Amino acid sequence: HTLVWGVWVNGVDQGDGRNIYIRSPPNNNPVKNLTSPDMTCNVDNRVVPKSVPVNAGDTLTFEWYHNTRDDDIIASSHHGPIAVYIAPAASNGQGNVWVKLFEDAYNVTNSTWAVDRLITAHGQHSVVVPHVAPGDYLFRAEIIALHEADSLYSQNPIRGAQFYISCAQITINSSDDSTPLPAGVPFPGAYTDSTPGIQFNIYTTPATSYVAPPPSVWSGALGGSIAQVGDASLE
Ligand SMILES: *[C@@H]1O[C@H](CO)[C@@H](O)[C@H](O)[C@H]1NC(C)=O
Ligand SMILES: [Cl-]
Ligand SMILES: [Cl-]
Ligand SMILES: [Cl-]
Ligand SMILES: [Cu+2]
């Protein structure tokens, strides 16, 4: 159970974005229905009044929280992967539009899931803004908690993978458009009951065997990381 508070750009806090530049849902409940329109940008998908200005090559940091800013972030039970997608705003996230900029699942060296490292990062994970056409974009940050993912929601609605989905309105101003955005996948539509990484048993299956849901990360993606960029407690 987690939500996005706001974003940082190049290590500078853009301020509380809830219902302002984040299309915030009313609470931190997960989305579980893979076929639901709620998979696109969660349960209150509407245009919010601001869009955060960035340039290609900027570092865009999402900041998550549980109940209050810079708290326990997400229950340490909620092991799973993290991804970020982009689509043009014109789409409203409908159709084959979502392009993957970032994926982290299980790190063999540190023996840690993306979610474990997000807690250590005080809720902060980043992407580098790609060299796409200037204009208005949606960045969709997605955490998949796998603690009940031995079952499928479609078969047992009281279990299943849990999706914490947040859409940020981002305006890309300076970009030479040298890596124009390629075709995307649909949400809902990309994840189905047979997709690798949707049904998994984290209690019996080695985390080293976990494969995150496709699609693969776009070759045009400029970088990204789970790491604290800024100290919320200094405001
Ligand atoms: C899953 O979402 C689809 C599409 O909106 C809907 O028809 C179906 O009733 C949903 N399932 C549940 C259990 O609400
Ligand atoms: Cl749901
Ligand atoms: Cl960190
Ligand atoms: Cl980064
Ligand atoms: Cu939860």
Curated annotation (Swiss-Prot):
Print the keywords alphabetically.
Carbohydrate metabolism, Cellulose degradation, Copper, Disulfide bond, Glycoprotein, Metal-binding, Methylation, Monooxygenase, Oxidoreductase, Polysaccharide degradation, Secreted, Signal
Modification Methylhistidine, positions: H1
Activity-regulation annotation: The polyphenol cinnamtannin B1 contained in methanolic extract of Cinnamomum cassia (cinnamon) acts as an inhibitor of catalytic activity.
Q: Which GO terms describe its biological process?
A: cellulose catabolic process
What does the Swiss-Prot or TrEMBL cofactor note state?
Binds 1 copper ion per subunit.
* Top-level taxon: Eukaryota
Q: Where does Cu(2+) bind?
A: H1, H78, Y164
Q: Keyword DNA damage: yes or no?
A: no
Pfam families documented for this protein: AA9
Q: Name one GO molecular function term.
A: monooxygenase activity
What EC numbers are recorded for this enzyme?
Answer: 1.14.99.56
Q: Which residues bind (1,4-beta-D-glucosyl)n?
A: V9, V47, V48, D58, N67, V129, R140
For this record, the Gene Ontology CC terms, alphabetical, are: extracellular region
**Which InterPro entries does UniProt cross-reference here?**
AA9, AA9_LPMO
- Disulfide bonding pattern of the chain: C41-C167
Q: Which cofactor does it need?
A: Cu(2+)
Catalytic activity, as annotated: [(1->4)-beta-D-glucosyl]n+m + reduced acceptor + O2 = 4-dehydro-beta-D-glucosyl-[(1->4)-beta-D-glucosyl]n-1 + [(1->4)-beta-D-glucosyl]m + acceptor + H2O
Report what the protein is called: AA9 family lytic polysaccharide monooxygenase A
Q: What is the lineage of its organism?
A: Eukaryota, Fungi, Dikarya, Basidiomycota, Agaricomycotina
